[PDB]
Amino acid sequence: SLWNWFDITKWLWYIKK
């Protein structure tokens, strides 16, 4: 909960690539 949820989901989209 320390991170911003809306920032995590944007970067997991980048790690998939």
Epitope: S1, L2, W3, N4, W5, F6, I8, T9, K10, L12, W13, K16
Partner: antibody, heavy 131, light 109 residues
Amino acid sequence: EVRLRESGGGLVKPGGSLRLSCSASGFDFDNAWMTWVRQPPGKGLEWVGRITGPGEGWSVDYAESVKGRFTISRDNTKNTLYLEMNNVRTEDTGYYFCARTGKYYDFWFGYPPGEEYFQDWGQGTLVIVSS
Amino acid sequence: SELTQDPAVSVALKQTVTITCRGDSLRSHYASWYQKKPGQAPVLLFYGKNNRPSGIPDRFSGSASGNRASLTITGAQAEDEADYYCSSRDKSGSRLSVFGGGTKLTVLS
């Protein structure tokens, strides 16, 4: 163990004001996202808005049919959620629910910002708007 | 109302009927399902890709393909008669949520 209590409903003329309260207990309320959902009588559910947690700056997202009129705020020391209603129109009549909002985001097939699902629901409070 | 859904669907007792929820945002986001009985709080039935909350009968199940999300009731019973709703993002990448019109599932018992 999760319990949600809506209260503060009643009668109001169009253009009036009102404040709704959802006291929560059972979970960790400081981190849990909370959502208001309204239901016109004889109609379907309608997403009013949600409030986020600490890691998100407590940001709030509103419905366009509601933007500028209602406000969502939370008091973590009382475990209560608030839905301020100003310039209340006749279309705001209905049962309003507060729901514990869960966050979902599949790592392999998801898409940001993921999805949101409403785990635990309250039994709602009735708001009637008429002239 | 980005999620389109059947208004009324009928089912014979102890048969299988699937409720369909359609929306352009369903091509990128999963859908969650809710049971709404008259005068009772909604109950989360299904969410995510394949997540059923405990305390829910295993006859509920979900499916998705393209812009279509589907809830499946295998062998519908009398208590299964209620209003069912879908929910997901209103748009791809949007921070807003939205429900569907709703399905009145009538069980012929």
